[PDB]
């Protein structure tokens, strides 16, 4: 059993918010004809440059060609050796490793005729509560529109959301006020995400005024600059609400643990390099008796299926998670998208081999994009995921 070829299909898929993300669907071929599919999710984050996929294919084939897909530890080591962890939230090399590693999980699972679930430790639950995102307001005039989103998604079953805040505290507070005002306890906003936009003492003042509205608030996320472990700690000591932060590298996670800087570790395959790396981060968190939430970069059904399996295998997830990609994207690349019911992400059928997903070549062709080049976008738009 050995890898013989690799395919990288770039796609451009807009969201209902109008923001257009580019992803790369991965295909790993073997000698026995079995193919694994994966996803390098959302390359549309800073820095403002793009990876050459023709070159990337050679590099990855160079690493993978002839390897036994079951040597995940070995292969992941070589992937990390060629794509070092950078201590940065959106390292494109992490998205790359993720697409390879999750495609390998698909490949291995299909080969054994089992669900990726049974290759990750099984099930602890069959679905995980998630939340729909309301992107940050920079102006008060954006509030009304986001209120329609709440009203609309709530009707479709999502009773839990999360709010990106920090750029205009007045608009943030206005939105929260309007929500409480109109839906009362019908809607919950499980977290206010600062996206590392504020220094901790500034986050502290903002947290203090935003938490006047507690609609089932579960955590405050990224309330300090990237890698400001000490800032996170001081803030963790000053706020009653749990402090969550994303895990984008092992070194960074080690440091937050040593400093006891946070309460909840937001782990998501795409930012840490894949399912193999996510399990490592998750287990490190378990060993440290730390809570975990399944974060997201908002991925397509292939990626969401992968994280769904992993998510339903974790025993230390006691809060609402964030993957709602398929609901946010107007398009997708599979025959049947992962399912969301009542604000819950369902783990794919445990009977279906592999990821429990199937590619739709017509959709691939439809959303096909020549490369990962950027479009006219502003820094603010990239940070807020707006258009």
Q: Does 313 bind a copy of itself (CB under 8 A)?
A: yes
- Tell me the C-alpha distance between 39 and 41, whole Å: 6
In contact, 194 and 166? CB cutoff 8 Å: yes
Q: Does 201 bind a copy of itself (CB under 8 A)?
A: yes
Q: 70 or 346: whose CB is closer to a copy of itself?
A: 70
According to DSSP, the residues that pair with 61 across neighbouring strands are none
Shortest distance, position 242 Cβ to a copy of itself, whole Å: 7
* Helix (H/G/I), strand (E/B), else coil: 36: strand
48 makes contact, choosing from Mg ion, a copy of itself, none, with CB < 5 to 8 Å by partner type, with a copy of itself
Q: 111 or 175: whose CB is closer to a copy of itself?
A: 111
The residue ranges that bind Mg ion (CB under 5 A) are 42, 297-298
Shortest distance, position 72 Cβ to a copy of itself, whole Å: 5
In contact, 40 and 23? CB cutoff 8 Å: yes
| Helix 72-82 vs helix 53-64: crossing angle, to nearest 10 | 140
Q: Does 331 bind a copy of itself (CB under 8 A)?
A: no
User: What is the x/- site pattern for a copy of itself, positions 159-198, by CB under 8 A?
Assistant: ----------------------------------------
30 makes contact, choosing from a copy of itself, Mg ion, none, with CB < 5 to 8 Å by partner type, with none
Does the annotation place 123 within a ligand binding site?
A: no
Question: Across the beta sheet with 243-246, what order do the strands follow?
Answer: 132-134, 160-164, 188-193, 219-221, 243-246, 264-267, 291-294
Shortest distance, position 160 Cβ to a copy of itself, whole Å: 20
- Annotated catalytic residue, options 88, 111, 132, 164: 164
With a CB cutoff of 8 Å and minimum separation 6, the contacts of 271 are 89, 90, 94, 246, 247, 248, 295, 297
- Tell me the C-alpha distance between 311 and 127, whole Å: 8
Q: Does the annotation mark 90 as catalytic?
A: yes
Q: Where does residue 331 rank: exposed (0-12), middle (13-18), buried (19+ CB within 10 A)?
A: middle
Identify the residue among 2, 18, 32, 58 touching a copy of itself (CB under 8 A): 58
Q: Does the annotation mark 329 as catalytic?
A: no
Q: Which of residues 232-261 bind a copy of itself (CB under 8 A)?
A: 234, 236-237, 240, 242, 250-251, 253-254, 257-258, 260
Q: 277 or 298: whose CB is closer to a copy of itself?
A: 277
State the binding site for substrate.
Answer: 15, 89, 296, 385
């Amino acid at each position: 059993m050995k890898i013989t070829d690799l395919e990288l299909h770039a796609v451009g898929i807009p969201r209902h918010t109008g923001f257009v993300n580019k992803h790369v669907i991965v295909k790993i071929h073997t000698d026995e004809g079995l193919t694994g599919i994966g996803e390098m999710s959302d390359f549309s984050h800073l820095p403002l440059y793009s990876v050459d996929l023709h070159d990337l294919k050679q590099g990855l084939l160079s690493i993978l060609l002839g390897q036994n897909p079951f040597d995940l530890m070995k292969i992941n080591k070589e992937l990390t050796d060629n794509f070092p962890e950078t201590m940065y939230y959106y390292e494109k090399g992490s998205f790359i490793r993720n697409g390879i590693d999750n495609a390998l999980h698909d490949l291995c699972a299909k080969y054994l005729d089992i669900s990726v679930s049974d290759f990750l430790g099984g099930r602890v639950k069959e679905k995980i509560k998630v939340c729909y995102p309301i992107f940050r307001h920079r102006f008060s005039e954006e509030v009304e529109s986001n209120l329609d989103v709440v009203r609309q998604k709530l009707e479709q079953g999502f009773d839990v959301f999360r709010l990106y805040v920090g750029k205009n505290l007045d608009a943030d507070e206005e939105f929260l006020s309007r929500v409480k005002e109109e839906f009362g306890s019908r809607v919950r906003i499980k977290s206010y995400d600062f996206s590392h936009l504020l220094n901790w003492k500034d986050a502290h003042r903002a947290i203090k005024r935003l938490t006047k509205y507690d609609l089932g608030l579960e955590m405050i996320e990224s309330p300090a600059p990237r890698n400001d472990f000490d800032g996170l700690y001081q803030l963790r000591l000053k706020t009653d609400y749990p402090i969550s932060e994303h895990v984008w590298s092992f070194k960074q996670q080690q440091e937050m643990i040593k400093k006891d800087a946070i309460d909840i570790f937001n782990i998501s395959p795409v930012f840490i390099g894949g399912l193999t790396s996510a399990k490592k981060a998750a287990y490190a968190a378990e060993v440290a008796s730390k809570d975990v939430v399944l974060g997201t970069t908002q991925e397509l059904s292939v990626g969401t299926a992968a994280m769904a399996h992993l998510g339903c295998s974790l025993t230390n997830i006691n809060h609402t998670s964030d993957p709602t990609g398929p609901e946010l994207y107007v398009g997708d690349v599979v025959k049947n998208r992962v399912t969301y019911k009542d604000g819950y992400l369902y783990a794919p059928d445990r009977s279906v081999k592999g990821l429990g997903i199937e590619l739709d070549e017509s959709l691939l062709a439809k959303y096909q994009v020549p490369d990962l080049s950027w479009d006219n976008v502003t820094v603010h738009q990239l940070q807020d995921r707006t258009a």
